Amino acid sequence: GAFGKREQAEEERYFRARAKEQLAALKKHKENEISHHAKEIERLQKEIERHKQSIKKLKQ
Amino acid sequence: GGAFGKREQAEEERYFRARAKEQLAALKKHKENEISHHAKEIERLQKEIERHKQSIKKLKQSEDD
Questions:
Q1: What residues of A are in contact with residue B62 (Cβ under 8 Å)?
Q2: Could you tell me if A33 and B59 are in contact, meaning their C-beta atoms sit under 8 angstroms apart?
Q3: Half-sphere exposure (CA, 13 Å, Cβ side) for A20?
Q4: How much is the CA Rg of chain A, to the nearest whole Å?
Q5: Could you tell me if B47 and A47 are in contact, meaning their C-beta atoms sit under 8 angstroms apart?
Q6: Do A55 and B45 lie within an 8 Å CB cutoff?
Q7: What CATH code is carried by the domain that includes residue A32?
Q8: Could you give the number of structural domains in chain B?
Q9: B53:A45 CB<8 A
């Protein structure tokens, strides 16, 4: 009946929302990982900077 | 006799000049070694960064997938 397609419609919305909650949690995890790698990169570039300044001193 | 007095001094002069240049070379040697170590380190660190950048590239694709 009318109350049968409302159910269907709502059940559909429900499952779609569950599907998107999951896709978002997976993306969240990848973003966290990207985040870590980025952090490391910045750290390594600071070390490079230190070495580059050491060289500069020595060159003079 | 007298030309000996002179020649001895010309030789002494050459001797100390060479002693000076030997020290100068030693100094330049360690400077270059140091600079060299640092460069090597820099290259090593840049490769690590390259690894991380590739890791990100991957993660971004799989995430976009």
A1: 30
A2: yes
A3: 6
A4: 26
A5: no
A6: no
A7: 1.20.5.500
A8: 1
A9: no
